[PDB]
Write a protein that binds this ligand. Structure first.
Ligand SMILES: COc1ncc(-c2nc(C(=O)NC(=N)N)c(N)nc2N)cn1
Length: 245
């Protein structure tokens, strides 16, 4: 997250921290995700595509720091890693960039809700807030494009929804962005998602309810003028999510 503020898991309790075990036993951060029901975490397919094997992954819920065990966290293995069969990657843009992780603990149980662990509601069909609505994004991604390290503390910020029309303009993304994608950005381009934020939540208030409107997918750089963050448009994937959960 470029700009924004540090936070703790209490403020974004559906946020899931996804890690991979390497050949040798070293464990590294991969991507964010979101808890959409006790047994199911939703994330982005591009995060896993180089390593499709579900035994390689560990998911934490209730975790506020990248490399320390937050008090109250839960740890899960991945019992079902569902990548979207229509996924594709161009030079920049990712299509159908959505993934589902079925989680189960070593004790064979799903998520138990707490002050640090909650689900996030899905939108209803094709129901998005209007452009200019403020939404929040959360993650452990880079704080500056040129950073090598990820921040050790969880971060969040606020971006505003941009219209498909505006995001289609030539100095934005042209035809790289489609109707199953949503654009969001800061008016001053001062805060954004970045590398390491992929798979994480874009959450908006809709009908006075917090709703998983987007999943961090891609962008050209981070916090660049005329280059919004691009998100998987969750309200356009509900059939796929229903059929797979
Ligand atoms: C040109 O170098 C470069 N490296 C990484 C990224 C990148 N960006 C976003 C991203 O959300 N960008 C954004 N919201 N502007 C992302 N999720 N993952 C990424 N790897 C972009 N550019």
């Amino acid at each position: 997250i470029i700009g924004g503020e540090f936070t703790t898991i209490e403020n974004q309790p559906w946020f899931a921290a996804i890690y991979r075990r390497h050949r040798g036993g070293s464990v590294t951060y991969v991507c964010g995700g979101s808890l959409i029901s006790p047994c199911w975490v939703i994330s982005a397919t591009h995060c896993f595509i180089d390593y499709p094997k579900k035994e390689d992954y560990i998911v934490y819920l209730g975790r506020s720091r990248l490399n320390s065990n937050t008090q109250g966290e839960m740890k899960f293995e991945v019992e079902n890693l569902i990548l979207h069969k229509d996924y594709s990657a161009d030079t920049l843009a990712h299509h159908n960039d959505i993934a589902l992780l079925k989680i189960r603990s070593k004790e064979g149980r799903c998520a138990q809700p707490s002050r640090t662990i909650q689900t996030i509601a899905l939108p209803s069909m094709y129901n998005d807030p209007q452009f200019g609505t403020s939404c929040e994004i959360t993650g452990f991604g880079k704080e500056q494009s040129t950073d090598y390290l990820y921040p050790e503390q969880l971060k969040m910020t606020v971006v505003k929804l941009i219209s498909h029309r505006e995001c289609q303009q030539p100095h934005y993304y042209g035809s790289e962005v489609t109707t199953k994608m949503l654009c969001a950005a800061d008016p001053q381009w001062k805060t954004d998602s970045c590398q390491g934020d992929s798979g994480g939540p874009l959450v908006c208030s809709l009908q006075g309810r917090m709703t998983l409107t987007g999943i961090v997918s891609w962008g050209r750089g981070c916090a660049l003028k005329d280059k919004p963050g691009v998100y998987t448009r969750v309200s356009h994937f509900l059939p796929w999510i229903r059929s797979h959960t």
